[PDB]
Amino acid sequence: TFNKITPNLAEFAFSLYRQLAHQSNSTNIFFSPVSIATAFAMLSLGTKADTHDEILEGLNFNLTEIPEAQIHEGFQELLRTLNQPDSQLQLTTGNGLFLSEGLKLVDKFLEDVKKLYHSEAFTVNFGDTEEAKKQINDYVEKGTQGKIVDLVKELDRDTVFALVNYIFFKGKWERDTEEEDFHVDQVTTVKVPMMKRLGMFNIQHSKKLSSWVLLMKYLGNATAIFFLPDEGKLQHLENELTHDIITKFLENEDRRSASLHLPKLSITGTYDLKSVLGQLGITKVFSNGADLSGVTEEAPLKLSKAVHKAVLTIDPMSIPPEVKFNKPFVFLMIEQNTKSPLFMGKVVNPTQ
Ligand SMILES: CCC[C@@H](NC(=O)c1ccc2oc(=O)[nH]c2c1)[C@@H](O)c1ccccc1C
């Protein structure tokens, strides 16, 4: 009842999250393990040898155990699922490959990119750095009907190849707000629109994670899992999270009475993938020794720029437990058919 690559995508999600969280603790985290991995698995089609193996190993695929055909077939099925009209009403995903004009491109790569990964490849004049950046940004804008604006802020002069990966999700629950205090830290407090409700929720307190665990369903076949840590236990929560633990919560359908304070938050994350994935061991494709002969046979080529942007916008006689999501919390968003991790992150400052 899951896609073959879902455990690998879950391991990739934890690796990417833990890297970002180890760097800074006062920063929001918001990315799509699915869209980033789809993009680099699509890119691997134009790569060979160590450049190739490094990308797939960097996405947590063990090439001695998983045949490469099962990886691409896994990604194609996941894309097939996400591109269903009901999911398309809530979720927009895209990859744009921008290659220098004057490069002789391999027809097989351009066809496989389109047929297997529903991505777009474009010819751009990197000789005009400012116009190159505008054509890339206008493609993302047109793709997200104006939601993502000026994604790329700076391009290197040597840029010959840019990768842009974006995902936009409109959050609307499957089935009258008021402002309230959000305790970012002990000396910081912001105000957020909070939905107050008493109802039967899929919520539980976990002793292993020392957190309240809330599951909620959204249109587009998506389930969000919110982890609200106990005082001083956010790091313990981040450390103890595993794919098996998350699968067991997703399996739980038991509800209880609870009074919840839920913040109506929209969230965004922007990442320099050359930097982030470099720390995960994906370096060859961004260096002069890159084997991109599947993209262009004659000329040297390296991936100069790779950017990710993720956007989420919201469209018993005993006194029941009162759970307020009014302080930093971790979350995952799963696609229901595949169990794939669509999003992963942490809200620490809702105004950041
Ligand atoms: C902890 C929950 C965060 C979450 N909130 C909601 O879905 C949400 C709240 C209030 C609402 O009032 C409405 O009328 N509709 C609403 C929806 C949402 O902001 C979020 C945060 C981080 C990751 C994913 C999501 C969906």
UniProtKB/Swiss-Prot annotation:
PROSITE patterns: SERPIN. It is linked to Alpha-1-antitrypsin deficiency: A disorder whose most common manifestation is emphysema, which becomes evident by the third to fourth decade. A less common manifestation of the deficiency is liver disease, which occurs in children and adults, and may result in cirrhosis and liver failure. Environmental factors, particularly cigarette smoking, greatly increase the risk of emphysema at an earlier age. Keywords: Acute phase, Blood coagulation, Endoplasmic reticulum, Extracellular matrix, Glycoprotein, Hemostasis, Phosphoprotein, Protease inhibitor, Secreted, Serine protease inhibitor, Signal. Glycans are attached at N25, N62, N221. The record marks M317, S318 as: Reactive bond. Transmembrane segments: none annotated. This is Alpha-1-antitrypsin. Changing M317R: In Pittsburgh; has antithrombin activity; inhibits factor VIIa activity; causes fatal bleeding diathesis. Its main location: secreted. The aberrant form is found in the plasma of chronic smokers, and persists after smoking is ceased. It can still be found ten years after smoking has ceased. The record marks K302, L303, S304, K305 as: (Microbial infection) Cleavage. The modification S-cysteinyl cysteine is found at S206. Interacts with CELA2A. Interacts with ERGIC3 and LMAN1/ERGIC53. Interacts with PRSS1/trypsin. Interacts with PRSS1/Trypsin. The variants S and Z interact with CANX and PDIA3. GO terms for biological process: acute-phase response; blood coagulation.
